Structure formats: structure tokens, C-alpha cells
């Protein structure tokens, strides 16, 4: 199956003499596995998934030292941008970066990613060819020219096709069992008063993992997507997710509606209806 690894980095400058705060989060298959935060008492990369405890001290030390360098790189880059955008000091600014690789079914590199944003908007990004850049505005064209001249793309291409792939493979082996785990959703339907002779039937899916899930309401067995109320999937806070979908059903004609829940952990889609 396909897999991925990403590092999401953030640098925020703040009013005063105080230095920016640098935060770096690593993900494997969209699951946080490592994290660094310059605001911490003893700032260093820390494991965020149990299977990373397999790595030795030299790993944490090397990653921590790379983060210290990044914290300085971001300070310099933030100061550079203030000039490109003609901004004075004493403001609040955000620089973000997403970097990583996607592996295909053959577990070979499928696509490399390297992008930046400033104040929450696209700044510059390495194109899929891992050779050229797409600059989002005039200021970024400055960085683009600077990087074409310095040949920065070659550095990122080497990482994306080499290190990124090598380590993603290692992490998948180390957190094998854990990363492919699935917690099937526990589902149930609740009945709500609503209006005049019309009630609300709400289908709940709780305690599932991964977050991917699909809820559907059916009329006598036939799909029913039109006036269905959905809620964005949300963290329960214990590592699992929640989600619900509801419909307003004419009083009495409850038992005619069925809710179907689809999730990778399920041996078969769940099928249920108003109970009680």
C-alpha cells in the first residue's frame, strides 16, 4: 500500500526583542511521530509514537542539532522576508514549511514535496520535477532567483529521493504493527424532537481509527444524500475519532430508515436504525 512522511515546520516572530518560536512536527502516514519546540525547557526532538522509542541517543541528538540549525535558518529567513515585503519590526509574522515524500504501491518515491508559506499564504514551492520552483508573488521571485543561482533544488532533490525514502522505509518497519492498526467505529442512533411531527435521527460513529470514514442514511434501503446533516470528523481526545450524520424523519416512519457506516476496520459495513 501507499505511504508518506512529512515534516511541518513553523516559525513565529513576536513583538519585542524575544526570538521567534520554532516548532517542527514529523508525520508518518499523517500520524505525528516526532516533535520539537523551542519554547520547551530542554528543547529537543521527542518521540510522539511508542514505536520511536526504538531509536537510540545518537538519533535524538542528531535530530535535535538539526532543529537548532533550523531555528537559526528560520530567524534569518524571517528577517530576510521583512525586507522583501517592506515590513517594519514589531509585528507578528509566520513562516511555515512542509517537506516530505509519498511512496507508491511499489514503495518507490512517487512524489517529493517542499513548500513554504508566509503569513499563511503560498510563498515558494519545489515543482514535481524536483528541479524548478513556483514562486507565488513578487517577493518569492526574489527567493526563486537566489535559489536557481545557488542550486538549492539539487539539495532538496537529494533529500527527497534519498534520506526521506530510506527513513520512511525504516519507520514503517519499526512501527509496522501500530501504523496499520484499525479501531472499528462503535455506532448508534439517537432520536430528537425537532419540529411539528418531524423528528431528527442522528447516526453516531465513535471511537474509530484512522479518521477516514463514510456515513450514509438510506430511505427503505435506497441511498439518501440531499438534506443530510454532517459534521466534520473530530478527535475524541484519546487518539480516536468521532463523526455523525443526521436527517429529519416524519414521526412514526422511523424504522424505515437505515444508517450505513463504512470504515477500514469493519469486517462489513455497519447497518443500523432507530432503536428504543
Amino acid at each position: 500500500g501507499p505511504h508518506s512522511m512529512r515534516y511541518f515546520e513553523t516559525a513565529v516572530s513576536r513583538p519585542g526583542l524575544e526570538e521567534p518560536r520554532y516548532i517542527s512536527v514529523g508525520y508518518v502516514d499523517n500520524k505525528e511521530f516526532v516533535r520539537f519546540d523551542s519554547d520547551a525547557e530542554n528543547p529537543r526532538y521527542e518521540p510522539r509514537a511508542p514505536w520511536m522509542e526504538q531509536e537510540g541517543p545518537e538519533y535524538w541528538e542528531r535530530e535535535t542539532q538539526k532543529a537548532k540549525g533550523q531555528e537559526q535558518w528560520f530567524r534569518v529567513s524571517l528577517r530576510n522576508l521583512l525586507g522583501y515585503y517592506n515590513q517594519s519590526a514589531g509585528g507578528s509574522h509566520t513562516l511555515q514549511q512542509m517537506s516530505g515524500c509519498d511512496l507508491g504501491s511499489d514503495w518507490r518515491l512517487l512524489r517529493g514535496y517542499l513548500q513554504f508559506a508566509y503569513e499563511g499564504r503560498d510563498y515558494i514551492a519545489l515543482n514535481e520535477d524536483l528541479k524548478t520552483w513556483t514562486a507565488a508573488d513578487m517577493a518569492a521571485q526574489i527567493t526563486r532567483r537566489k535559489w536557481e543561482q545557488s542550486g538549492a533544488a539539487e539539495h532538496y532533490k537529494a533529500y527527497l529521493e534519498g534520506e526521506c525514502v530510506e527513513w520512511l522505509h525504516r519507520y514503517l518497519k519499526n512501527g509496522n504493527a501500530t501504523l496499520l492498526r484499525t479501531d472499528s467505529p462503535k455506532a448508534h442512533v439517537t432520536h430528537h424532537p425537532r419540529s411539528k411531527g418531524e423528528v431528527t435521527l442522528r447516526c453516531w460513529a465513535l471511537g474509530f481509527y484512522p479518521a477516514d470514514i463514510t456515513l450514509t442514511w438510506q430511505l427503505n434501503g435506497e441511498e439518501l444524500t440531499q438534506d443530510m446533516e454532517l459534521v466534520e470528523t473530530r478527535p475524541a481526545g484519546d487518539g480516536t475519532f468521532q463523526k455523525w450524520a443526521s436527517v429529519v424523519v416524519p414521526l412514526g416512519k422511523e424504522q424505515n430508515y437505515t444508517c450505513r457506516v463504512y470504515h477500514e476496520g469493519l469486517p462489513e459495513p455497519l447497518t443500523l436504525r432507530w432503536e428504543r
Binding site: 515534516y7 517542527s24 514529523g26 535530530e63 538539526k66 532543529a67 540549525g69 533550523q70 535558518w73 528560520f74 534569518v76 529567513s77 530576510n80 522576508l81 513562516l95 517537506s99 517542499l114 513554504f116 510563498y123 515558494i124 527567493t143 537566489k146 535559489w147 545557488s150 538549492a152 539539495h155 532538496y156 533529500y159 527527497l160 534520506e163 526521506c164 530510506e166 527513513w167
Partner: peptide, 9 residues
């Protein structure tokens, strides 16, 4: 394993 920046923006 994280990537590092070399040339600045």
C-alpha cells in the same frame, strides 16, 4: 529524518 535548510529565503 528531517531535512535541513542551507541557502536562506
Amino acid at each position: 529524518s528531517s531535512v535541513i535548510g542551507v541557502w536562506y529565503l
